[PDB]
């Protein structure tokens, strides 16, 4: 049960990390079975 | 070596077309399962949901 949770807040005008309260909605919770110890960030 | 098919002869001979079915339960969340059976809606009636 891999869940993932997304916010999109462009409220911000950004210099570090904005100072404000927020919620995580859900989007799957789709199973892959096996556990995960890594991860890396695909960029193009 | 070839079945060597005929349509004249009886049984036994005939082409029988067969389809297999193979199922497992291992632990895992249920993902391909069947049909539920749905009813009407009523209201302002103490009943069972
Ligand atoms: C969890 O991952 C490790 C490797 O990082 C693996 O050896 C172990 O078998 C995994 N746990 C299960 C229950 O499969």
Same mark, same amino acid.
Request: include cysteine.
């Given at each position: ?14 210099? &570090? @990390? %904005?100072? +404000? ?7 799957? &919770? @789709? %199973?892959? +079975? ?8 695909? @960029?193009? | ?49």
């Amino acid at each position: 049960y891999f869940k993932i949770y997304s916010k999109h807040t462009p409220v911000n005008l950004g210099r &570090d @990390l %904005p100072q +404000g309260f927020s919620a995580l909605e859900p989007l799957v &919770d @789709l %199973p892959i +079975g096996i556990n995960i110890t890594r991860f890396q960030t695909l @960029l193009a | 070596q070839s079945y060597g098919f005929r349509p004249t002869y009886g049984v036994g001979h005939q082409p029988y077309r067969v389809v297999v079915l193979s199922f497992e339960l291992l632990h895992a969340p249920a993902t391909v399962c069947g049909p539920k059976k749905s009813t009407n809606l009523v209201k302002n009636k103490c009943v069972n949901f």
